[PDB]
Symmetry: C6
Subunit: 66 residues, 6 copies
């Protein structure tokens, strides 16, 4: 988790808009509200729970630093 | 489970209708009756048992805390 | 595991409740649960078969059944 | 594996013709030559090692008893 | 693991048997197995490629092996 | 981890251009900036975090030294 956790935490704390892409090709958009080992809480209209096992890639709207 | 459990449990307790989206694009709907480490029981006619490994997202029909 | 899944499958097993088992690729199987363990479900009817749980999305009983408490 | 292991072992010992369906819908056919925790070695003109993670169902050509 | 997979892959590696590796999405990769660990297989050719076992359905040797 | 980690570390230190194929057939291109047990940070027009569980293959643009 030495990369994933600080990365997700940075996006969370700075409230960076992100896109989360799913394995079926669906694009979800919002901000990382929180996360644990297995899931990410993505906010916009409501805060939906996204299982990491379904995610292919997380792409921030702007570059960020760790 | 610091987040998954309390979130699912809040949805369960408040009886909030949800959409559960499967990794193949299928959409399920109902209320969460119960859950464990590996499954979610989704009610609305007969209950159905949904394997977490097949779920992409759980989306509440209204915001919760 | 787990605390909900096993008694639910065992209830379908013991009561011979006919079920639909949907696979991750959209295939629907139908029969009765004859047996199961941690990783597989043995499904019987027209033909008997072993189903890996990793390929299953949902199990839907033909009628309501008692849920685990 | 209380059920999986004796079931695969019986198909093996009794040379039962089986059909193996993969998660992508491909059907493989033959007989179980051997297996371990993660893979099945399938035979019949073409020997191949199949990863259990890609298998949806194993369907024998006649019922087995355990 | 394990008791079948490892000697099977190791035999293919030592004997430099050309193999076909089918991915879960139906793509076929070809080459010779250069190396492997618990999670990946390195498939040697022009450039080698690192293949994640979780993406593999079957390994199919070009010739019967033992 | 004996093969995977030094292989990615080589790609990373040497900044080798790579293609990353996802299990759904999508091809990503760039360079490996960093990685851990579960994710790879892929640098292109902007960095993106890719879960290893969604990756099928990693193919360098030129031959590299193997572990
Ligand atoms: N996490 C998600 C969200 C949506 N979708 C796909 O996108 C479609 C539509 O999603 P959405 O934009 O949320 O509109 P819906 O009102 O859910 O459309 P419908 O319920 O009629 O399917 C769904 O059927 C589903 O196939 C998906 O696969 N995964
Ligand atoms: N401590 C952990 C555990 C897992 N994960 C992420 O969550 C995914 C695993 O989620 P899970 O739902 O538990 O896995 P499965 O869907 O069962 O995948 P598999 O069958 O390959 O085990 C991993 O790929 C990893 O990306 C993580 O970030 N940190
Ligand atoms: N958990 C589920 C539910 C259904 N489906 C897919 O959605 C299709 C139709 O949904 P549904 O009406 O719930 O099932 P069926 O009774 O088979 O549909 P129909 O009677 O319209 O053929 C099914 O064929 C199945 O491929 C799925 O993949 N996973
Ligand atoms: N566990 C299963 C069972 C079936 N199917 C798909 O369902 C299709 C047709 O089902 P069925 O007729 O039962 O199997 P077939 O192989 O088509 O039998 P046959 O061609 O001899 O009629 C198969 O091609 C297979 O891809 C699947 O993907 N997973
Ligand atoms: N384990 C397997 C076996 C086959 N297939 C798919 O089935 C297709 C056709 O099967 P096959 O006749 O074996 O095609 P080839 O791979 O081209 O076989 P060959 O060139 O040796 O004739 C393959 O291309 C592949 O997409 C697959 O997805 N996974
Ligand atoms: N490990 C791989 C390699 C290929 N593909 C699929 O196969 C398609 C094309 O095959 P190929 O021609 O070999 O890939 P290209 O992207 O066109 O690269 P190149 O032609 O230079 O090999 C890709 O779009 C990709 O969807 C895949 O999913 N997994
Ligand atoms: N004790 C267990 C272990 C796994 N399982 C189920 O089996 C799935 C994992 O099976 P598997 O080991 O075949 O997974 P893959 O990594 O092969 O996809 C989990 O997602 C659970 O649904 C279970 O129900 N109880
Ligand atoms: N601690 C856990 C264990 C499993 N799970 C769910 O159950 C599934 C178990 O699959 P594995 O056996 O491969 O771990 C995961 O894919 C995940 O959806 C979870 O969400 N939290
Ligand atoms: N202890 C175990 C773990 C996995 N398995 C099998 O191996 C596959 C699981 O692969 P995962 O390694 O990715 O855990 C499944 O087909 C499962 O039935 C097993 O048969 N015994
Ligand atoms: N010890 C291990 C662990 C995993 N594996 C293979 O790797 C798969 C899981 O890899 P992932 O961690 O990438 O999901 C298993 O299903 C199995 O095919 C193995 O062959 N030996
Ligand atoms: N030791 C480890 C642990 C995880 N992994 C990667 O992280 C992913 C974790 O998902 P799973 O737990 O579902 O296997 C694996 O699919 C694999 O690609 C790895 O490559 N080596
Ligand atoms: Cl019910
Ligand atoms: Cl191909
Ligand atoms: Mg599950
Ligand atoms: Mg699993
Ligand atoms: Mg897991
Ligand atoms: Mg696994
Ligand atoms: Mg796996
Ligand atoms: Mg694994
Ligand atoms: Mg690593
Ligand atoms: Mg995986
Ligand atoms: Na598992
Ligand atoms: Na009942
Ligand atoms: Na798929």
């Amino acid at each position: 988790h030495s990369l994933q956790d600080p990365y997700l935490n940075t996006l969370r704390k700075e409230r960076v808009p992100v896109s989360i892409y799913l394995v079926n090709g669906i694009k979800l958009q919002g901000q990382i509200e929180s996360f644990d080992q297995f899931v990410i809480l993505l906010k916009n209209t409501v805060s939906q729970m996204v299982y990491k096992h379904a995610i292919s890639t997380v792409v921030p709207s702007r570059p960020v630093r760790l």
